[PDB]
């Protein structure tokens, strides 16, 4: 696991996405202050967790002492990998 | 590699051409270059000695390149001295006569620096320099 | 005509410091000086072509830097030495004309075919030769002044002429460092040389200006470029470090430090914030939102 | 220990740092009198102790009779050396 | 200009990057002495110039008297910046 | 190997740095188009290879068919690691 | 001018430093008679001039009739001072 | 040796002094550009070597490849220590 | 090292050249220098004696350098006296004639102080001084 620790010694960035949606640019131009945009994800569903833009897990939003937090729920595996690929 | 201190004698009736040849030789790494206006002056400077290479024009006043080459070859002390012939017209008869006289190379005006460098390299390789 | 070597052949990392060396030498390349010399060279070539009705070939040699005594020791004698002043810089410059170049110019001006070179007998230059040298020096100074305009406008003024180096007195000490730029001039089958020697102290204030190879700038394009560059740099991040105080101690006391040991320090009225060790501001310390906070008082101007 | 005492006989300067933080120069220019800057260190954590700019120990702030003081808590060792190196 | 001088009295570090590329850790482990790694930047393109890790300009490699040098060519500008980001 | 594959299914960015140097902001402001900046690294020395800003190896510049390339030479190694951190 | 004269009637000590360098105590112990220590200052650079340990100017070494001398060249100035400090 | 290593992991500054002299402030004010000041040390004598302002050894000036250097000659020694303190 | 009190006789038709040579000798540490305008005056001063080295020009009025050298060598009291020859033209025939006459050295105008110092050092080494 020497090479494993070697690579682990690299800082990386984690990204949590609230949701995804598709819209036309005309609709984007119709958006002003106070405009409302709906997301394709249902309310309460676990949010996507991304490492450098790569989805690796899903989590739920929590509040920690005055700060937002993500509760790790479930990872991926080629099954989910393919599942989300198809999804 | 050829000796960079080799002494070159440039013989031509035009001073501008001699300066151009000297600059081309300097760009090639040869800095010991002397100039001669005609065959008589070239022979007079050759009698001084110390030259290792000659670049001479074909048509020159009071002595042409062929006569100068013949005189150089007739001299035992300078019979082995390489001579490069530069001309404006590459007539076959003149080239054959120069080859029979013992010309080491032939250049035709106008020419590029690459051609002159190639001729010098070939002459040096033939002489083992 | 036998050279000196031919005549001889036929006849036969730790160094001690010497404080008499004035080691303030520029190990950096003076490109700008090279560009000025090239420009000077071309402008003079033209001037010589106009004066002598012949096409001259001027080659700029390497800008060798050496002590003044070495430069004096390598000057052929006798020679034409001309003292010049580069205003507003302080000092006296030298324009050295070799006798061969002077003789070639005299030959060309007075109808000389160039087939009979004049051998230097060691005699003083005549009044007509002096006037010819005068004209050549005026052309050279005009070319030098025009060449220096692009980098730093300087006025070149001739002072006096000498034939021996001892009378120049351009340097305070023989070990002083000077900048010499040799030039080779070819006219037909005749070759001449001249040298421009400048003491380093004269050009020392312009050291930074001489260093980099510079040119082609602007006033409004450069203005916009600088403004945008300033805007871009403002987004860069810095590490702000605030020192609580400083304690003067000894290394032995450090070795005796143990958990619970209390070190007395002077209470600072203000906290100084340092960026990479450089103080930038003074402030008071406090706590905001559960974290230590600094209340800025003054900015270090 | 003769050479040891020899070197010990040299005065040296000790520096205690309240905390460290990173900010942009634009934010620094936005700072005026009364501005607030947060530090990356949590309140109450032992402060870094530096000798000539070299971190060798950590300490806690105390008041001594009318003067600030630093209570030595824990030193370093290659483990912490590497630890803070990684940290 | 006053604030300009105040921030001028500060040293900063400049970084020039030869190029960027993406590879897997397995490929990194397959790298040994003499291994070859290709970069996403074309040969001859101006290299990225960074201040404290922030890209602000681009430059070209030159050799100065025995030392490498970077010739300033053009500022980052917003569009090129966003493009590199999307990259 | 399982964790090795799990982290293998992640993209990362590799960075090659031409060299490093230190200068004052005043000198940076004195830089214009065509200005020359020297680097602390000698010409020909292997260039630093960084993963997400972390130095892990050194390499040499090569040209591949029309593209710049870095030839892997040697790993960073930890004594040199601390030494460069100290630099 | 009155205060100028009042402080003029005071003797002070001037100190000229050949150069500065940093080394470990182990290296100092490795030094014997004839050992060589390099200085961070380049040969020929003006030497620091200090008054009671405070750097105020720079000068060059000269020999006066049989005695060493320092030729005043330039005052310290604030920027050069801060630069030496960061050094 | 343990404490020796513990203090070895510390950077320190070394100072070399060209010479010492005493003069009045009036004489200092009489000094201008090009003025000459004599030092009490004879030309050629080994120069004082100081660690953080503490004299510990003496050395001689040498030039190393383009840089000034100090050749270690002899330690300070304590009788000479008191003598110089008294000076 | 050569004796710094050695007496030098500088012979040249130009006073400025003689002054230049005297100054160059003074810079080399030799202060006992006398000047002669031509070969006749040089021989007259040599008849006085006390000279240890001679620097003479080739072409001088009423006596050239070669004749002066021949006269010096023909004199038994001065046959071993070293003579340095300085000329404006280094013709091979003149150099050979001077070498046959017994010239100790040869200098070609124009020259530098380094060349003169090298010639003096070589002459002194040959004479064991």
Author numbering:
A (entry chain p), D (entry chain o), E (entry chain 0), F (entry chain u), G (entry chain AB), H (entry chain w): 51 to 137
B (entry chain i), I (entry chain h): 1 to 129
C (entry chain S): 5 to 16, 34 to 322
Describing publication, verbatim:
The bacterial flagellar motor is a huge bidirectional rotary nanomachine that drives rotation of the flagellum for bacterial motility. Here, we present two high-resolution cryo-electron microscopy structures of the C ring-containing flagellar basal body–hook complex from Salmonella Typhimurium, which are in the default counterclockwise state and in a constitutively active CheY mutant-induced clockwise state, respectively.
To obtain the C ring-containing basal body–hook complex in the CW state, we constructed the constitutively active double mutant D13K/Y106W of CheY (hereafter referred to as CheY**), which can mimic CheY-P to tightly bind to the C ring and lock the rotational direction of the motor in the CW state. The C ring-containing basal body–hook complex in the CW state was obtained by incubating the recombinant CheY** protein with the above purified basal body–hook complex in the CCW state. Further local refinement on four protomers with the symmetry-expanded particles improved the density map to a resolution of 4.4 Å. CheY** is bound into an open groove between two adjacent protomers on the surface of the middle subring of the C ring and interacts with FliGM, FliMM and the prior FliMM domain. At the interface with FliM, CheY** interacts with FliMM and the N-terminal loop and the αN helix of FliMN. The α1 helix, L2, L6, L8 and L10 loops of CheY** form an open concave surface to interact with loopα2–β3, loopα3–α4, loopβ5–α5 and α5 of FliMM. In the interactions with FliG, the L6 and L8 loops of CheY** clamp the α11 helix of FliGM. CheY** also contacts with the β2, β6 and β7 strands and the linking loopβ6–β7 of FliMM–1 of the prior protomer via its α1–β2 surface, which enhances the inter-protomer interactions in the middle subring. The binding of CheY** also induces a significant contraction of the loop LMC that connects FliGM and FliGCN and results in the formation of an elongated HelixMC, which not only reduces the distance between FliGM and FliGCN by ~7 Å, but also causes a CW rotation of FliGCN by ~28° on the binding surface of the FliGM–1 domain in the prior protomer.
